[model samples]
Target: RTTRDDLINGNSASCADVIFIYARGSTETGNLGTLGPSIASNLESAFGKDGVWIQGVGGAYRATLGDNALPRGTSSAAIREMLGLFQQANTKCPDATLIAGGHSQGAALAAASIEDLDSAIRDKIAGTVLFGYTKNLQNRGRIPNYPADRTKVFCNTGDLVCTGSLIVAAPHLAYGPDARGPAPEFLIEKVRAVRGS
Candidate 1:
């Protein structure tokens, strides 16, 4: 089973070779939720317990949707929270590579924060993954200045959420299964490139 604690709440002491910072979709309970936990588990398995840290972006913000639309305040708040998390990992674990990921509304949150990160913090990021990306259509399948080579997005067929539709379909909730497959493979490869291992 997937274990989501410690950094999930943005508090941890141990350092590792990698740090995975995740933001759960709106309305999902806990910071990691279903998709984040599954992917975190896969990363843990590949990097081993001592080599990675898993964090779910945490703060006063509640994952809420307003009229089935994302609120500007909420997105801004999440971006601040994400930036802090990135800086924390960079400072606390200087040798660690960073990975950013999210799902649904959370995907938008993660993507938005990339450009705001300071170069020192941003350079440490080795990979990024977005599941059920909410801004896939708006962003034209890119996360702005973030390198496309280091990022991965999953949008299942019939996933209206990624198709620029605000409707949340069943496909949006199906990424937990892929967490064990392509998700981990993508992350592992990116981290390997950074570590040259």
Candidate 2:
């Protein structure tokens, strides 16, 4: 996959205070174009257009396995792509923070990338926002490890696309099922309300 666009600026904005890394869903059609607009709108509502940085990665609908058979599912190569984005962000906005956002399979990729980040770089992240994630996987306890205070998941009840069941491992692993729960959603809202305050 190639890093297609950085939305912070046309040419000068490379470093970012926040980064939005999206995941891939259907190889048949590109959904990021549609989803990106919504996510951008939501983020702008929360942080304004210039308050944070946004980067979009594209060209990975094939789900090519890197090494393991468990679906490349955001392999080291993917994480490296994200790291490059972070490096760009650091160069352009040294004082910026990092955050990830994804939907469906993209959500899984976002979680995996966070897990692979080096400790120091991981520490610079502010949080993650996920949408349309499955609860079953999270229920199994396969959620990625993050500084609890920073990571969050969002799911919609009865939305089969967001239903748990994609988790495929012995780790009882999944994204945080409780992230979609009422309480956590409330907390997520609160956090967004106070970001940068």
Candidate 3:
């Protein structure tokens, strides 16, 4: 069985115009509530009154052998669920641009989801924000190389979570600016502006 959490809210009456998908970390104790408010506030501040925050958590962070054998990480099923949620946003907020953001394991899931989405649907995605993510995934070596023009990855050099793990075949393709404190914030603001959020 799979476990999940989702939070969807918007400010239809305001001018802030963007639809956001915020994926939470993966752990036995992972919860959207832990990160939802902060992310929402950040988005609202960057985009304004029209910003919308939609959140989802990956499958069960902890699974037992007898009760549940699935790995305690993001799975294809989880990504599919997120895609369905994105579809809902496409329908509900037709005027709003879509963006995806995730931290740690959540970041991996976001990357996977984007890879799985249809070309047209993926084109609708304006940008992606990945924090604390490393080059690892189930079976997959490193996150597949996304088009440089559309995808952005953020990694902190000192962050243990962002270093040495599985190596990808195409290391050169997986590139982004070091996410220094001020740099990430600046990038996010710029992205928000481009999205008209």
Candidate 4:
């Protein structure tokens, strides 16, 4: 199987130009959830299948409704796991440019993780992509300390979660379509800017 196909458990067998870590939304099965794989696939197509490595943060936190309502919108435990994933990615592929992504509760998880990352890991992050971020309104649509130019926050037309509302809707589940265009392009450009090749 290809690298992307073998990415369910944060495992990448070989080094690549990019390492993409994804955090799935609340209650979603598997590490990648429904949207993570699509975005990874899109990145593969744009960046070269083997040039992009994919990994998913799995079974770290409860991903419970209670955690989503917290001030940080995610658990400290989840943040630890996500950051660990980043550290692992860095250790495994020291030369790879890292990219972070998440949806809904996972988006919050990614945001928290990014802020807590050590400077070494933080500097390795080439970009971030968030869909239906539960804290979109709270953070005013930006991840603290991460560059706005390198981050793509997608709050669909009626994704109430983006407004800090827990209510789920069609718009929130519609980010799959975004993987085909803007989402991947956002990361692609960032990687190109970093790699310059």
Candidate 5:
């Protein structure tokens, strides 16, 4: 049986070797809410779930889509919490590969966390994928440092969040199927590149 805590922290199933931490955009729900299943499904389609472990960061000093969410100061707080979780997971499986991402506010938080990952863990991160990445966070210095070759950022052309608009909504929430294409593929390719399974 899967519980909210199970999804948030991830037991990683059996013999877990790869870790996927996907943060939610904002609003209600935990574990990246709806995108979690989509992401896991797409990646698992290629890699198989038996070896993949998934977690989602929500319910923290987080934010809501109703609010600008990216602005203000909660990003660092959430980053710290995520870092703590990453560190714990790293300790348990020092050799595990990592894949991280998020949407909207979670994108900014995940971006910051990825950039600040301790050197020991940084090299192990196989790749990343972000949706509705916010220009506001980028301008505020939350810009991701994931290697360009190992990252897939999906933002609809007119996405207000990507453009740095804080008042608009809808556009910020619609990330097409397969998350605007290429994203799932990019994530799978990177993860495979790491382990050669």
Candidate 6:
């Protein structure tokens, strides 16, 4: 049987220069929803070089029946998965520029990933992008750790995720989900910036 290791570093002739592990905002049904596809599509349009890969994290974590509990559902597990993929890409393409991002709940995944890495691996990262981050997390002193020089955060003026009141549900939708945002273009620019870094 081909092992996980085999899939990652094997002579599959596939290696990514940039890997984006996106998280669906709050969707539990495993759909890429709005943010994931928009970012990916724009990226593909801008850099159709075949080395950019996007991995949606929400698909890997499922909800338990009837209850709100998730079995492999902890944020850590999701982060680990993305990290594993990042590592595999690194092993296969040692000089590849590693990058990651997320949306809403998935933004948390992106944040956690950078935080979880040690300096050695952390330094290799080219950038980290996030959208629809909740203000509550910031108030609670929760923030993802990453190099400021390589991070870009995007939250629309009216999206309400980052600036909404604490009393109501956060308005967490990227470019209105069915819409587009300043993020895609910004992301493409960031991607271009990392080409030679």
User: lDDT winner among the candidates?
Assistant: 4
Model 1, residue 188: distance off in Å is 0.8
Order candidates by TM-score, high to low: 1, 4, 5, 6, 3, 2
Q: List RMSD in Å for every model shown.
A: 2.5, 6.6, 7.3, 2.7, 3.3, 5.7
* Local error of candidate 2 at residue 72 (angstroms): 5.5
User: Which candidate model has the greater TM-score, 3 or 4?
Assistant: 4
Q: Can you write out model 3's per-residue Cα lDDT over 1-197, one digit (the tens) per residue?
A: 11222234444344225666766654423444234345555555665543445445543322111211223235656677677767766666666667776656666667767777766666666766666564433423334545555555555445554554422223322222332333235436646566542
Candidate achieving higher TM-score, 2 or 4: 4
Clash numbers, per candidate? 0, 17, 2, 0, 0, 0
Cα error of candidate 3 at position 171, Å: 21
> How accurate locally is residue 174 in candidate 4, as Cα lDDT from 0 to 100?
87
Query: What are the per-residue Cα lDDT tens digits for candidate 5 across 30-126?
Result: 5556566677777666666666776777546355554445353235667777887677668766777888877777777777777778877877777
lDDT of 1 by residue, 1-197 (tens): 32354454443466778889888887887787778877877888888887788888768436676523754214677788888888777777777789888888778888878877887788788999988888898887788788889889999999997888888888988886677789888988999997997
Q: Positional deviation of 76 in candidate 3, in angstroms?
A: 2.1
Against the unseen true structure, what C-alpha lDDT does each candidate score?
A: 0.79, 0.50, 0.52, 0.82, 0.66, 0.54
Reference-based lDDT, residue 23, model 1:
82
Q: Which parts of model 1 have CA positions greater than 4 angstroms off?
A: 1-5, 8-14, 71-74
Question: Better model by lDDT, 1 or 5?
Answer: 1
lDDT (10s digit) by residue, model 6, range 1-197: 10112224344366666655555555444435555666677666665737566556543443222211222223556667767766666666676566666666566556666677666666666666676654323533234456566766766666555664322143443344532555666556666786853
Task: Point out the higher-scoring one by lDDT: 1 or 6.
Answer: 1
Worst 10 residues of 6 by lDDT: 63-72
